[model samples]
Target: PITVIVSGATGFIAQHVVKQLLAKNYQVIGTVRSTAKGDHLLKLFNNPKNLSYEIVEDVGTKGAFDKVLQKHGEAKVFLHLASFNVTDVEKELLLPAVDGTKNVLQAIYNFGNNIEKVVITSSYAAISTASKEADKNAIITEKDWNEISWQDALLNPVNGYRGSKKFAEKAAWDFIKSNDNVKFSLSTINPSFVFGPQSFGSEIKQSLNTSSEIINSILKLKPNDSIPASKGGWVDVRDVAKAHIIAFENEDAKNQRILLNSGRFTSQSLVDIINDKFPDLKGKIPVDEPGSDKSVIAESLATIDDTKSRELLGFEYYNLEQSVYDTVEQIVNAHK
Candidate 1:
């Protein structure tokens, strides 16, 4: 039995990923920062016949992975998903974000002799190069980097959270290259606004947060709506989980980092598609411009090509329309 270690087990996407790993019959060691929050994660697989959990005080600590490996040895895979995500471009949180990633990579390096694969959760911020210095003309790709300097990231009212992600990914690449004991593989899920059915709880009632804010806006029919003209990339939590599984299980996944660009829907195109496919949702769904400032978005069609992830990992995604419709359905159904 292959043992897989997942960091940040209580997060939104981590919940889905952990459940799928269990269903596939993998022996999972899920790491949570707090034991109190472990209930939600444990309840998700209350009776997974082959599952286990642990509380790692500081998973990014110097010996974190070694401690886990000490208890659950002979592990072959490590999925580093624990993150401190923020919307602010430059805030106090970026340091922990960087430190957390550094801790994970260092721990893995300490125990690199036994690991086969390491999949880190990185955001599109890393792939969307030149994101900080957006031109009305530039289209982001895997090759691009966040052009904003750390000083600029701190000084500007921009999204330092995303900038932190960019920095973390760079740290991973450098760490992997500088070390040789472990033949680690790299891959990331670059999902745009993830939404899906409830894993165990509602994203909305989770305090200072609402369930599927992107989809809920549409379902509530907020006033003065002007759905933007650019494309919005979204991936169902299910498919994103499957992407991680395949990326780890598939043999071809070694020696390369693949990015999954799940589902992309333009703003107006989004409204039209929903209205056409889910007619009942018409008028109920809010249609409005995406953000307050043009600087928040760069390209009119911010769609990323998921071709590599599909071909390399045998990835398949749900229809964008169905994903949205089902999302609304879940939100509505949860009330009943």
Candidate 2:
């Protein structure tokens, strides 16, 4: 059986990845912050025989994953998903995002003997916006990189997250470039906003990640309030998980960044979709016009193109209605 090491195995996306790996009878060793979270996954997955978790409290610490990698011997793949998400720019987000990535790669180089591949969960934020003179009509590909600098990112929390992803991914690629001896292929999945059923099924309300919080934000909007109109895309969590596995296993997927987005969307369009699906929530959603940022975001949304991902990875993406409805149904069921 193949042994896979997954960082942040208790995370939103990681949970789905771990579960799918277990379904295929793969040996999965996940990293978490505590035994409590690990235990939670143990029970959640029905204590599968091939699953285990290791405590990695600080992913940015030097050689934090070395001991675990050494203990597990050689694994087939390692998936890095343990990036920081707090509000602080440098202290909380940037340092961990960049250093954590470097630490993982360093550990793999040092101890990963039989590890054949690595997959990183990058974000669309890294490739979406960078140049002031960006082509409005252009379709974004994996070749694009965000131009946000450390100084600019430090100016705001959102920019910080964007820069963190941008630099962290760059660090990973740089690691691969500088180390020519290592043979493990590195691949990244840069997904748009992800939505889908939670790992805990109907118990989604109990633990909501930042991505799910966007759906909740829409649900919380009152009638007559202006909904923020931002142009971006959405992808199902399940598809994102599959992309990681595909990138890991497919030899053609080496050293490439795959953009996994189902389709484009606006905040208002999402709200309208939700209201149409759930009539009871109609009065609760926004009724006023879109926010002032619509024009800027629309252009940003236009730049994304996932044609390469579709052809290369054989991805069959879920539409917005399927993604949103399934997610909302889970949330509703949790509350019921």
Candidate 3:
């Protein structure tokens, strides 16, 4: 049986990734910060025979990720989700993260093992732009990168996040390029705002991860409230999780950055999908301006072109309505 090691396995995306790995008959060893999180996931997945957990409190530590790789030498694949939440953009968040990427890779290089592949969870923020930076005429492809300058990233936490992903991913590729003896190929799954049902019913809560909050942000609106003209590439959590598996299993995705977005959506898209499909949510959520962002050309903000990525994975993607309906369906049930 094949073994996979997943770091920060409690992340919103990581949960789906872990679940899918177990479903595929692979043994999964997930790294988390505490027994509390580890325990929660074990129960969430219903004590799957193939799933296990390890405590990796701070990935920023000198050899935090390296230690995990050392213990699980039999692991055939490594999937990393940037799951630690802390302040200090450069120190805690950015610097150590990029540093840790190299640290883990060097360990894999140092401690030769059966690990065959590495998949990192990157963000659309690494590929696209902040609202003001977006060019309406540009059709963003996988080749395009987030162009925010380092100094500008310091100005806003939003862009600071983009920098974290952009550099960390680059660091891995750099490490691979300079080090020829490394055994495993690397793939980075760069996804936009991912939305869908929680892989487990227990994942729903009063608050959610940053991307899932995009849906909740809409719910927070009053009927009379005007929706923010937010817009971006969109994908289902299932697809993003599936992409991780595809990344390691498919030769076509090796050493490549896969853009995992399925489509595009706006705040209005959420409002419309929730209103149209979820009648129970009607009075609670906003119903203001049906074509609000459309009337405003929300579509003008940089369209995503991930045709090459789709061609490699070759899977059907959920549309905005299906994605939103499933997300809100879970939200409504969780709160009831």
**Against the true structure, whose TM-score is highest?**
3
TM-score of 1: 0.82
Which ranges in model 3 have alpha carbons more than 4 Å from their true place?
84-88, 129-133, 295-299
lDDT of 3: 0.80
Best candidate, lDDT-wise?
2
Model 1 score (lDDT): 0.65
Per-residue lDDT value at 102 in model 1: 74
- Candidate models: Cα lDDT each: 0.65, 0.81, 0.80
RMSD in Å for all candidates: 4.2, 2.7, 2.1
Q: Write candidate 1's Cα lDDT for 58-123 as tens digits.
A: 765566667776676677888877763345544455666677777777877776556778888776
Reference-based TM-score of each model: 0.82, 0.92, 0.93
lDDT of 2 at 263: 73
